[PDB]
Design a protein around this ligand. Structure first.
Ligand SMILES: C[C@@H]1O[C@@H](O)[C@H](O[C@H]2O[C@H](C(=O)O)[C@H](O[C@@H]3O[C@@H](C)[C@H](O)[C@@H](O)[C@H]3O[C@H]3OC(C(=O)O)=C[C@H](O)[C@H]3O)[C@H](O)[C@H]2O)[C@H](O)[C@H]1O
Ligand SMILES: C[C@@H]1O[C@@H](O)[C@H](O[C@H]2O[C@H](C(=O)O)[C@H](O[C@@H]3O[C@@H](C)[C@H](O)[C@@H](O[C@H]4OC(C(=O)O)=C[C@H](O)[C@H]4O)[C@H]3O)[C@H](O)[C@H]2O)[C@H](O)[C@H]1O
Ligand SMILES: [Ca+2]
Ligand SMILES: [Ca+2]
Lengths: 899, 881
């Protein structure tokens, strides 16, 4: 007999005018549905399912779902879930369905084809071509020989004058395929292609700059979503200069006046030309034949037009190449030329190109290609080539050659810092912890969301403007905030927006903080091929910039869990903008700010002037927990899935590198075949986050990840001082966690750090406590409750319990949330009030702060800005978390405190 | 016995907050003041710029020194007979000294300013040098760079001649040369230059008119063009060395090598706020010692680069030193194009380029600020850009011989030919400024100076007085509207002026060579000017818009008008015209490129187009040079035939053997050029007057006169007789609608008035006839003449009928002039007369438009309004039936 429950999914924003199939996630109550013994139906007012994560007990926690492209787009989609008991007490009779369209593949020795019903595309299993051909339903080829291009240079000149005496040696590469994979379903098929960049033209090289590219194809869709990621493994002499994706468009049978070129301009504008310019000649071929060219239709046979024009094609020139380049965030240049050899002709251009180009004909068809958030990921470009020839070229430049080349070398020389002592003394003035050869981008990554669109004939510009919009704002379905909370499938430590007017203005300040930071991206132009998605760490109130050039006060690189603030803000609110902002952050931080290959695979790089400048390579930047929310909302984004998997090697890095090497007083140092020393707060919050997630996903290494998390949780519980213990040692063969170097025989150590609880520890711990349920090692929960309570007890209370008082605690507003927890967990209203007091009257932001922005115009600044010189990013992140977590755990004591 | 009058001069826009000396012109009525014996007092530097025929003063020029006292009006009194900068000259270099600044210019070498010095004797800048970089080839596309290695060559402007007009308030310093190689492909000297330095008494700002003629191959691709200076800054502590960049809309960027703001430790709110203000920071002893030690770990920012490679977006970047990466700097849209380098104690320099972001691609660099001497470059063309591709935009399309060329003309509207797609001999004048400071100034001063150069102030005469003097035309009068029909004409001129002024911004008519011009005709299907079909693209003065705009300013005094007209005349005079070689004096005709079209002609180069901007401004010395250049326009008619290819004869040109001129299409421009050199009394005036006054007399004795087609000009005797296919007179009658639209009625109108009683024969009739007869009845085109004409631009030629009507006193004609204006071709009173906005997927960027008009229409519509109102507004009331 039956268990069945429904859960509704809404468009992130407005009901979109078009979508090309979407994937969403739903959560489910702990203990309610067994996998593969639960079916899922869909009501849209008037469904392809799979599990992404499971509960402790093995029931479904998070699933993911996929709907085909449709012209029916509903205000809401409701997903019912019936168990097997439902269909197995029947004597009623379903009709059996049959979708109007449904994907079919052909797996092959040579290639692999995927037929959506509107296109068929081929995926070579080897070679230097990712997509062999893209076919309409007609059977005709619309684009083909899709390939990844990369150019480099060997050197870069000191300054412009120096070009004369320094020679740049250029070299070209082809994306070489090495594996192809498939996740086939009726509704959507993921094609994952992994490989390398290998040489073809210019100087010889090792194969390098790896890539994985994911092609997403939905039933009934000529749209193909492309998630292109590369790990960077260049060295001192590897300057990327172009990075791109190129397709051949046929055009062979096509009268030039019937071949059309389009680019997206600004605010949903389209550029509309053909290879041969019949509009605005001296002589007219007729209202209707001009009107039809502009509209991308096939023109009548030449014997129908006033022959003063028809007898004179030959003299009307023929435009082979077009070029859109976006090298700043504010202006794009656009040009064309007749053929390779002539000067180009400047076309009237504009500000911020929406980043799509189409190339085809009214008969031969064509494809279009584009990059989501195009101008925000400058320097980018869109190229057409050989449009007057037999086979045309259409290319998306992810990094335009027209730009200055990608320069990832260290921004300074070391400033003469010799040894650890100087390194730490640099940190006291610039807030940077430098080390020679740590200022490196070796192993960082970047993903880009690229769309391809196939066309039978030239589409209308209104259809082009639409797809261009589509791409830049890809429709997203998301579960209800209320329901995501009920399930408890994404943490206990947040809840929806109370009655207290104090609670009310706390929400208003979260919206202030958010509105500011969103506004501050545009105003400070936090855009760029690698930069976009991140923001900075502290303001310079004298200069009125953010501190882009002062060591650690520049790029924020997930310092004090801004990720958590913004994702928890989304979970509560359901705001589009909250998501869109957190999406962009998780895409940067997850990819740029963590090392994916190397001896540091697992670590991420602390805030710096570059995103890899600082020597602090630590787990608290890579921190899986920061990705956890977006993995599940989104329906297991398979890239972010890979990124969480990567991180399951973090623990190994403590054999290589100690983050305390410079400050550790107990002269420890790691050796091979020995126990390694990580932190019990910041370091372990990352390890344990990653181990929880693999356990939850039931991945290849789940039994392992489960084991490590339980052993380490018992270890901390068996330590003596628990988390107040500084930070023990860990055996990589036995996976157990023992006391630190200076306490061999649990006669407890004390090391306190204000950082230990602001990089996901509360979140990870609660989740883990919940997961292990009864199986939890005895006294872990107490050890954690201790840490929570004692942090901001009296100094006597601390001395009494721990020997010494906690002399270096700060971030009290930040830590207010640890009270709010232990308050809830112990049903102690005096400890609840500790939260509200430490939040309302200690450090961070404070209720009587300005809580407004000032405008700064005129000669003090390059360009007009708004500023709030009174807040820093560390302030807004931990404030935000405190607001959400204190309201979560102790709403009921807030009015009590106020009164 | 005394004759004294007065004449008042006004700022162009609002009263300026600040100027740096100003030169301005004043016209004077005919036969009023004798040169060398008429004194001038303000409430004053003076000199003659044009003279009347009887030698009396026609246009003067005047300079006032830089002054903190700045007044609303300035009044100059002229007085008949009846009633301070210091230059030194060592045997090496000349130095001008204004009171504030002292600049030394070498007489030779690859350095053009030696050093700049503040009254205190302190060197703030040094080694002013013209920079250039070229490359030999450009890749076809971006994949082509590993299989086509590119060889760069570096040059720097060698000096050849150095002239000095010195006076008390003002001191011009004119330095000619070309770019002599240093490192790179052993290249011959090329790219000749004229740089004019204006230095006024009192100022420490310098006006710098940098002119340059392109004289290079299909292989000479300019990557970078700069003006470069060394800032000393030796014993200035790092934290006391400042950097600025003007950004957007009165903004200024403000750092220093070695940041003391933004740090973990705070030295002291006073200290920080000094660095931001650009002041010498207090002793290290007064600092907080956690900041004052540790200075060795705070990095030093040597290099700074601001590129503006589009019209809407600039970048900004910094580098500790070369070898390390750059760090991106919060940037924005449209840099106003100044930069400062210098120090609190050591002082320093600031360079800037007027209209910086409009003349893209441009950069401003600062280098070696961590060193003992720092570089400060203004790049006039940015090495960051693609390298200036002056080649032809097509390979001819399979066109072989005149048959094809002319046939293509019937579809794409361009007259092609091989070898004529060449920019050899075009020029371009960039207006630069330099600013010398004893100490890093207030960044509110840098803002006001960046405002200074992007809108340098202008002192111009009263329109009522310029009309009264008759120094520029009698063919224009002030709006003073008395009918309802008049004011709607005035409104329409204002409609036209706005629409055009906006189209520059909307259609992005911006760029190194592009900025100043507009386009010819619109494409109503695409919603775009015809930027890619032959002669429908760049308008290169066709049908005399230069002549409409500069007239509109004369009448109004609108600052906008002046500025629009200015930037045009700064383009058409320089980039469309040829300055060296065989075609020197001919302008290329309207095309996709400014030099694409094979029809190189005199109608474009027409000196009348620059006449007004020359005299207003007080004889701009670069425009003065150009007006001379055009005196060798006639030399080109034994070198090229504008009527070849359209010629059914066997004829072919050689020098010193007679040629045919269209009396409007060719003569109007020569007459104009000659009448100017005469007016000015230049190195060739006597020549010019004889050539002009001959060719005038020549016409009056052609039996039919202007009604005869072309003339027969003898380069040896400088005379003009009847054309081939009519020797011995008897009579020729050949009419083209193109004659009266390219200057004719303004040159004839001015020459007649300039000559008075020395006017030959009945030239005045020979003119009057063509005016009356151009659109009389075909029956009256027998009664006189005997061969009924074959009529083409009637609204435009309405001006000519109006001229005759005033000169005759003939209201029959005046009413016909109005009936052609309102009821013939051209625009038409019932026309749409509004703009339509266009957006969505129909265009790239949203835009306004009127496809019911084109640039031909508006120019001749505009001239027609102004001239029919001036001559025959009386008849407008009476007309309205
Ligand atoms: C192990 C490793 O060691 C260093 O590489 C580095 O530690 C330094 O940076 C820390 C960090 O990045 O968070 C940290 O900083 C404090 O906390 C942050 C939030 C503040 O921005 C800092 O001002 C700093 O504050 C303390 O210092 C000050 C101050 O004004 O300087 C005032 C407060 O009262 C103090 O709490 C460490 O303290 C630094 O050693 C790595 O982070 C670390 O993991
Ligand atoms: C003689 C010499 O040779 C040619 O290379 C070229 O002539 C051609 O271009 C002219 C030009 O201005 O560029 C003229 O076009 C002339 O007048 C302008 C105002 C008009 O656009 C034309 O109107 C001709 O236009 C048409 C038409 O094509 O439908 C009909 C009208 O009645 C005409 O006014 C245009 O003729 C020449 O006519 C043209 O042959 C050089 O410019 C020329 O000096
Ligand atoms: Ca970052
Ligand atoms: Ca031009």
């Amino acid at each position: 007999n039956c268990t069945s429950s429904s859960a509704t999914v809404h468009w992130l924003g407005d009901k979109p005018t078009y979508h090309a199939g979407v994937t969403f996630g739903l959560p489910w109550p702990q203990g309610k549905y067994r996998p593969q013994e639960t079916s899922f139906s869909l009501t849209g007012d008037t469904l392809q399912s799979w599990a992404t994560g499971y509960w402790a007990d093995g029931s479904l926690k998070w699933t993911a779902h996929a709907i085909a492209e449709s012209n029916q787009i509903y205000d809401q989609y409701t997903v019912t879930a019936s168990s097997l008991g439902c269909v197995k007490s029947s004597s009623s009779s379903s009709e059996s369905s049959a979708p109007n369209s449904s994907i079919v593949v052909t797996d092959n020795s040579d290639a692999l084809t995927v037929n959506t019903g509107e296109v068929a595309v081929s995926f070579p299993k080897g070679g230097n071509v990712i997509i062999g051909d893209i076919k309409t339903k007609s059977g005709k080829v619309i684009g083909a020989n899709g390939r990844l291009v990369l150019q480099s240079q060997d050197s870069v000149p000191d300054n412009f004058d120096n070009r004369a005496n320094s020679p740049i040696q250029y070299s070209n590469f082809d994306g070489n395929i090495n594996e192809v994979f498939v996740n086939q379903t009726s509704a959507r098929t993921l094609v994952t292609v992994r490989g390398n960049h290998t040489v073809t033209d210019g100087t010889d090289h090792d194969p390098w700059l790896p890539f994985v590219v994911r092609f997403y194809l939905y039933a009934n869709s000529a749209t193909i979503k492309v998630m292109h990621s590369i790990v960077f493994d260049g060295d001192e002499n590897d300057f990327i200069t172009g990075l791109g994706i190129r397709f051949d468009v046929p055009l062979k049978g096509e009268e030039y006046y019937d071949r059309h070129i389009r680019f997206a301009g600004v605010d949903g504008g389209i550029f509309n030309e053909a290879v041969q310019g019949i509009t605005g000649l001296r002589r007219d071929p007729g209202e209707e034949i001009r009107a039809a060219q502009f509209a991308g239709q096939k023109l009548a046979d030449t014997e129908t037009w006033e022959p003063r024009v028809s007898t004179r094609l030959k003299w009307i020139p023929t435009w082979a190449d077009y070029g859109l380049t976006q090298l700043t965030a504010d202006g794009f240049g656009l040009k064309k030329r007749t053929k390779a050899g002539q000067s180009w002709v400047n076309i009237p251009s504009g500000t911020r190109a929406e980043g799509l180009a189409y190339l085809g004909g009214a008969t031969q068809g064509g494809l279009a290609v584009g990059l989501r958030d195009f101008w925000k990921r400058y320097p980018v470009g869109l190229d057409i080539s050989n449009a007057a020839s037999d086979t045309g070229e259409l290319t998306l430049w992810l990094y335009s050659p027209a730009a200055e080349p990608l320069d990832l070398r260290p921004f300074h020389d070391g400033l003469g810092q010799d040894g650890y002592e100087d390194q730490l003394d640099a940190l006291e003035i610039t807030f940077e912890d430098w080390e020679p050869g740590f200022d490196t981008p070796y192993g960082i990554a970047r993903t880009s969301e690229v769309y391809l669109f196939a066309f039978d004939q030239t589409p209308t510009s209104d259809k082009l403007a639409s797809l261009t919009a589509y791409m830049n704002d890809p429709p997203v379905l998301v579960a209800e905030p209320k329901y995501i909370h009920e399930t408890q499938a994404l943490g206990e430590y947040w809840a929806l927006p109370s009655a207290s007017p104090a609670a009310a203005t706390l929400e208003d300040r979260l919206q202030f903080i958010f509105d500011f930071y969103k506004g501050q991206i545009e105003q400070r132009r936090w855009y760029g091929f690698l930069d976009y998605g991140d923001f900075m760490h502290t303001y310079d109130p004298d200069r009125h910039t953010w501190r882009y050039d002062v060591g650690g006060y520049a790029w924020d690189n997930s310092e004090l869990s801004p990720d958590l603030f913004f994702w928890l803000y989304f979970l509560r609110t359901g705001s589009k903008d909250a998501y869109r902002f957190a999406e962009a952050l998780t895409r940067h931080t997850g990819e740029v700010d963590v090392y994916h290959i190397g001896d540091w695979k697992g670590l991420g790089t602390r805030h710096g002037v570059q995103h890899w400048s600082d020597s602090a390579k630590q787990a608290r930047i890579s921190q899986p927990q920061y990705r956890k929310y977006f993995f599940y909302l989104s329906g297991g984004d398979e890239r972010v899935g890979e990124l969480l998997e990567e991180l399951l090697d973090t623990d190994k890095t403590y054999g290589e590198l100690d983050p305390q090497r410079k400050v550790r007083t107990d002269g420890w140092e790691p050796s091979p075949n020995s126990t390694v020393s990580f932190g019990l707060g910041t370091d372990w919050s990352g390890l344990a986050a990653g181990w929880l997630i693999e356990w939850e996903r039931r991945g290849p290494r789940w039994e392992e990840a489960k084991t490590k998390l339980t052993n380490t949780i018992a270890g901390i519980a068996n330590l003596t001082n628990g988390f107040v213990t500084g930070s023990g040692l860990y055996d990589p063969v036995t996976w157990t966690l023992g006391p630190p170097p200076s306490d061999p025989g649990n006669r407890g150590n004390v090391s306190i750090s204000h950082l230990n609880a602001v990089f996901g520890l509360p979140e990870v711990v609660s989740e883990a406590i919940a997961y292990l349920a009864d199986d939890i090692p005895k006294g872990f929960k107490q050890a954690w409750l201790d840490y929570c309570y004692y942090y901001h007890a009296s100094a006597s209370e601390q001395k009494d319990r721990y020997g010494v008082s906690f002399s270096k605690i700060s971030l009290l507003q930040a830590h207010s949330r640890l009270a709010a927890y232990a308050a809830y967990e112990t049903k102690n209203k005096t400890l609840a009030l500790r939260a509200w007091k430490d939040f309302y009257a200690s450090d961070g932001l404070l209720p009587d702060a300005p809580w407004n922005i000032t405008h700064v115009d005129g000669s003090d600044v390059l360009v007009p800005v708004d500023e709030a010189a009174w807040l820093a990013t560390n302030d807004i992140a931990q404030y935000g978390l405190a607001v959400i977590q204190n309201l979560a755990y102790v709403s009921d004591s807030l009015d009590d405190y106020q009164s």
